[PDB]
Amino acid sequence: SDTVPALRRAVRILDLVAGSPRDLTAAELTRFLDLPKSSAHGLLAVMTELDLLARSADGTLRIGPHSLRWANGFLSHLDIVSTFNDHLAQRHDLDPYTVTLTVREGGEVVYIGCRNSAQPHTFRIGMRLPAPFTATGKILLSDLGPGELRMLFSQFPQPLTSRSVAGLSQLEEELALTRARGYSIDDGQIREGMLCIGAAIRDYSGAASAGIAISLIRSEASDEKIAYLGEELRTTANALSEKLGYRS
Template sequence: MTAAGRLLAVLDAFAPGRSSLTLSEISRRAGLSLTTAHRLTGELMNWGALERDTDGRYRIGLHLLELAALAPRGLELRELAQPYLEDLFHSTRAHVHLAVRDGSEVVYVETLRARGAVTVLSRLGQRWPLQVAGTGLVLLAYASPEVQESVLHGPLKRYTPKTVTDPNELRRTLADVRHTGIAVAEEQITLEGVAIAAPIRGPGDEVVAALGLVVHIDECEPRALFPVIKATARAISRALGAPSAKGHALSVH
C-alpha cells in the first residue's frame, strides 16, 4: 500500500455509525499496525483532517468539510437547491432527500427529516445501492447502459422482504421510471416507508441529481405527491440552467 493509500485507509475507517474511533479500531479497520496508525493519525490531525476528543477517540476534522464544500455535486448543489427543498418539506411534511450518484451507489447530499414521520435510515452522506432507494432508481434509470448492466448483473442485496432482487423486474422498473419521470420504491430499505423520486437536470439536460420524498405507506397515495415533487425537481433544474425546465413555474404551496 502506498503512503497515500495508507492515509486514505485511515480516513476510510470512519463511516456512518463509526464516527468516533479509538486508535486500535482505526488500526484494525485500516489494516495497519498500531505504530503506523499512530503516526498517520498524528499527521492527519496536524493537517486538520482528524480531531481527537478528550477521551482519546478520533473524529473527522473540519478541514475535510471545508474541502467538501468545493465539490460541485455536493454542497454547491445543496446550497442552490436548499430553498426549494425547504418549500417541499413544509408543503408535504415528509422526509426530503437530495442525492447524487457515485458509481453504483446513491449518496445523500442533503436530508430534511420530518418529525413524527416514518422511520428512515438515511442521513447526510449516507450511501445506498442504487437499486433500493427511490433517488437511486432515478439515477440508475438515467445512467449509462454500462452502469445499468453492471448493477443488474451484480449482487442485488436484500434489505426487507419487499426489496427487489430480480434483475428482470428491476429492468422493467427502470423503463417505467424513464417513461413517467418518477420512481416509487415501496418498503425497499425499511418496512412501512415509500420513497418517491424525480430527476434533476443540469445545463446539458443531463440528469445530475435526484429529489426524493419518503412517507409512511399508509399516510397517503404516492401518486398524490407526483405533481409537487416533479414541480420542485423542475424548479431546481431550471436554477441549474436545464433547457427543458425553462418556462415552467413552481407552485408547491
C-alpha cells in the same frame, strides 16, 4: 410592472440574439422592440458599447464574449445543496415529508442533503445505499441503457427487505415505468413501512446529476395520493433543475 425599462428591453434583445441561429441586423431586431426606431437603434448601439453585443462588419449583432465571464461565475458558485435547501423553504406543500437529495456513484446513491420532518433509514449526510432499492436510485438508474446497467450489476445487491427488487429483470421493469412517468416509487425496499417517491434533478448539460425524494409512512397514503405526489415532485425537480442551468 415595466420597472427599469432599459434593462428589460436589453434582456429581451439578448434572448433574441442568443436564440437565433442566424445573425440579425439592427433593423431585424428593432422589429421585436416596442420602441420608436431611433430609440431602438440607440439602445442597440449602447449595448454594443457596453460589450453585451458585438457588431460584425455587415452590421449583424451577436452576443459579446463578456457574457462568458458571468456564465463562468454561475458555474463556479453552483452549490446544489444550498439551492435545494432554499427551494424547500418556499414549498410548504412538502413540509409534512422528509426530503433527501442524493447523487449516484456507481451502484450506490450518496446522501448529500436532507430536510427532516415529523414522519416517523434515517438518512444521514454521507450515508450510502444501493441505487436499485432507493427512489432516487431508481430515477438516476433510469437514464442508463441496458448495457450500462449490466456493467454495474453483474452481481446484483442483496435485498434489504422482503420487498427489495430481486434482480436485473425486475429492476428494468421498474425503470421502464419510471421513465414513462418521470417519477419513481420505492415501496418499502429499504425499510418496511417506508415509502419514497423520487424525481431527477438535471444540470445545465441536461444530464441527471442528482435525485430528490420524499419519504413517508406507506400505510398512510393511497395509490392516488402517491401518484399525485409523484407528479408534484416531478415538477418541483424541474424547477430546481432550472435553477441549476437546465433548459427544458
